[model samples]
Target: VALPVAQVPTDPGHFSVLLDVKHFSPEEIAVKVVGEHVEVHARHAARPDEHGFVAREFHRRYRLPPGVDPAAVTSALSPEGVLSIQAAPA
Candidate 1:
């Protein structure tokens, strides 16, 4: 499971992307450049627990401004399950 959280703002001129991950790695999380929004997604299948096996998925959406650029996004994740993304203007 991943925590839904985003509050980091970069000084380079664009907002940053962040996510708390458990079973999913940064590599598993993907970002899609939709028409005027950015969609993020990740899927994880937890091992059988005391109850039973489970499948979990997480996603977040961000709408960019008119002159903003989604293609200029930059991202980085830490081993502690922290992800950060930065971008420049178009």
Candidate 2:
């Protein structure tokens, strides 16, 4: 969820979201929905720079196209740090 990711289509109703989480671990990532958007977020193991405003975090909200099974989303972190998601978008 680096705000620099993409979701590619694999079928009519199923798709895959691809992303890279270099500054974080697979255990630290999250995905959720907010109104008309689906949110993807992650944080670093390092302390954030509050005063400097350089928080070691990343987030990106992807607009959902109606018809998705939120509970059925499946995601995986590749060995090379790529996040491959079988997003159950309807």
Candidate 3:
């Protein structure tokens, strides 16, 4: 199944991406960033007792688009569920 995507505003030196997993519970949610890839993990929220809870992982890599500074690239995750990454052209 396809996941939902949302566009977020960027600051002068940063950019952001928004993902929606409202269908899943907060307890079953997790996220990770490795190398140039980002991963999202989740499971069914309703079926907690039947081993019906499953973990789903998604990965995506990011590249500095044209005119973007690759050397300035930086990323951070907020406790409020926001993944922010910044990149600067070389």
Candidate 1 wrong stretches, greater than 4 Å: 1-13, 49-51
User: Sort by lDDT, best first: what order?
Assistant: 1, 2, 3
Number of the top-ranking candidate, with lDDT as the measure: 1
Give the TM-scores of the predictions, in the order they appear: 0.66, 0.58, 0.41
lDDT of 2 by residue, 1-90 (tens): 569668865555655578888667766888776675667899865455646444367888776555766666666777888876666655
Among these predictions, the greatest TM-score belongs to 1
lDDT per residue for candidate 3 within 13-40, as digits (tens), equals 4344455554554565655544544445
Q: After superposition, which runs of candidate 2 have C-alpha atoms over 4 Å from their true positions?
A: 1-14, 34-36, 45-55
Looking at model 1, residue 76 earns an lDDT score of 69
Per-candidate Cα RMSD to the true structure, in Å, reads 7.5, 8.4, 9.3
Residue pairs clashing, model 2: 67-90
Clashes of 2: 1
In model 3, pairs of residues that clash are 69-88, 69-89, 70-88, 70-89
Q: Which candidate model has the greater lDDT, 2 or 3? A: 2
Query: Local distance difference test, per candidate?
Result: 0.73, 0.70, 0.52
Kindly list the per-residue Cα lDDT of model 1 for residues 19-72, writing each as its tens digit: 776677666788777887777888876766679887789888887756877777
